[model samples]
Target: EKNVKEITDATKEPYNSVVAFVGGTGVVVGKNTIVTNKHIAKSNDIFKNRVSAHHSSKGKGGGNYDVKDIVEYPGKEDLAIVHVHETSTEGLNFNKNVSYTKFADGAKVKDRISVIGYPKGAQTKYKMFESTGTINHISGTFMEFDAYAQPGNSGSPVLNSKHELIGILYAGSGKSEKNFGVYFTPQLKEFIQNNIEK
Candidate 1:
């Protein structure tokens, strides 16, 4: 409980870069583009469920954007990129200002990390929350951390000391406080960059 904090200001840096889906979360990775879990993007119908980049805390004010496209990672990683666009009726593009966080240059085990996203999904009115902890282990494409996480936290950004992204939160243990995420590898970064809107 001590390591967790609720984000009361969604307009702030980092928090503003996060987008809330109906049941998941996403991190802005490029102009009008966000990264989420492949499971979230693939299993859900993007056309029917809109993605929102809130400007205020408690999921208020920011206009909902339609999904333009989705690209899933072509590997075992649970990652995907979503391209969002304003509906034809809405001329303003609020998501354009949503910034992307830089990936940590080098992340290692025991590094202090924080997982930020909407926990409990819509039940919490999409209020943003954060859990802080240190990386417990790193193995291949997956990493384990002790941050508290919930079901709706999948696709959340695992950030480092500088608020740089280090992994994509995807799973949690019901029997333990340890959670799992997809470590951002060079190849994964390249995949994200390539799928980013040109």
Candidate 2:
């Protein structure tokens, strides 16, 4: 389980106090009134306090949103939905032209995928990065990618060739080297249905 300390330490941005970490894909789900994760958001003290601080300081406008509620999946689905009090209009737009990855079922296997997020110690003006890979495998709540990921890349989005959000970047299996298998899980339709409102 990762914590807010690691995220802040990695990004060197204290403002990342309100971060989200999805289990299957490490896609950062923010700015849209919904933030989510496995057990990270609901069960960790570090993350809770940090998020609280963030919300107090910046509310939803600065990536700081209070996790007022959580929706959990049954059995081993390994998914959780977190409700952030702040909406898109409240947070700082990392990009003014913000677009979310379209949800596609496990239909993009063998397709080229791109992982996008801010990795540990990466000094980029945009505070994000993208890496290319192929979908290696997909399970009930997990997808594997042969992409390199660091600590800070957790919660990054895994996009298919069509630029659709297929999975979330969560973890990697390496010590120090860059080469590793990045693990992600598909975002179920129910997840979107339950969280997104018209």
Candidate 3:
């Protein structure tokens, strides 16, 4: 877990680029893969932009990788999977361990939840900061929260105490220290699994 102030400072230089983008869930599901918000991938026409996946093994600055492939949802699905070009399955150690959260057929209303990801302008002398928040509501495709997410927090993983992934952070209120709204993962699993390639 990282502090909000740390996250904000580290990401300050790239604020504009941070919108619709999130960092801190470690590497994507696959060895060289990354999972993020479809909106973040779509922000700069990611298919056309030079995307890079960054990671800190020790702290604020450490090592990073360039993205090679991008898998985006067709429509209505808010998640995207990006494959890192420079990553290899051979002997590469990651700072954060890889874990995939399973989705329930039906998530109960008022279920306790938490979000983990880098917020806007976060920076620390050692590593990137990750913000955590609780869930407040649920709809067909959205999970609302009072979590303190910021611009760069997009694509963050919303997890249950069991560390199961339920949603991906997408939008926030942008004011009043209140964060809200995440795109449910179950709704996009089919498309994400089908479209993403190694």
Candidate 4:
């Protein structure tokens, strides 16, 4: 039923890219690449079949898309990039001005942040969700924060106050004081860029 339109608070930059990565979640980082947790699935499995991202942030549904490649880092950081096959519909499916955040070297605790991804347990894979919080801590491999999360939220993008890519949501509290995300280090950034299918 069509009704009055609601002004979207969703940021198209991240919202349009947030996708359902098989059982978890992922985000489009480039023309052909999406970032997700390495533990979510092996590269072999990620490319063996078709994957789908949600149909724009304003809508509720899934649009089939093809996965052409995957790049999985060994360990320490559970991160991977899956490339999407391109077509005319590809532009309609996702935003074209895809740009990743350039995190400041001086970033510190308590900085404002947000996350957008699908919650596996939410029943509807295409029904994406959003979470917001401030940075709690940062380390060599993790960005700890109080932002709410759940099982299906894995591989979600964690953005800073300026909505710049800062980290990748991976782990949450387990007697642990804060939720942990794979901080967007230079290595991860390079990996994402290198894997974009040419």
Q: Highest TM-score among the candidates is held by which one? A: 1
Tell me the whole-model lDDT of each prediction, alpha carbons only.
Answer: 0.81, 0.45, 0.49, 0.64
How many residue pairs clash per model? 0, 19, 19, 1
Best first by TM-score, ranked:
1, 4, 3, 2
Segments of candidate 4 deviating more than 4 angstroms? 1-11, 43-49, 55-62, 88-106, 175-177
TM-score of 2: 0.60
Q: Write the per-residue lDDT of candidate 3 for residues 131-170, one digit (tens) a residue.
A: 5555667777777766566555677666565655566677
> Worst lDDT window (10 residues) for model 3?
11-20
lDDT of 2 by residue, 2-108 (tens): 11122222232222322433221233333333333455555642455323222211123334334556666554544555554443435544222223345545545
Q: What TM-score would you give candidate 1 relative to the actual structure?
A: 0.91
Residue 56, model 4: lDDT of 38
Q: Worst 10-residue stretch by lDDT in candidate 2?
A: 1-10
- Candidate 3 C-alpha error for residue 149, in Å: 1.3
**lDDT: which candidate is best?**
1
Better of 1 and 3 by lDDT: 1
Please state the error at residue 17 of candidate 2 in Å. Answer: 17
Can you tell me which runs of candidate 3 are displaced by over 4 Å? Answer: 1-27, 43-63, 86-106, 122-127, 174-177, 196-198
**Candidate no. 3 TM-score:** 0.65
TM-score of 4: 0.77
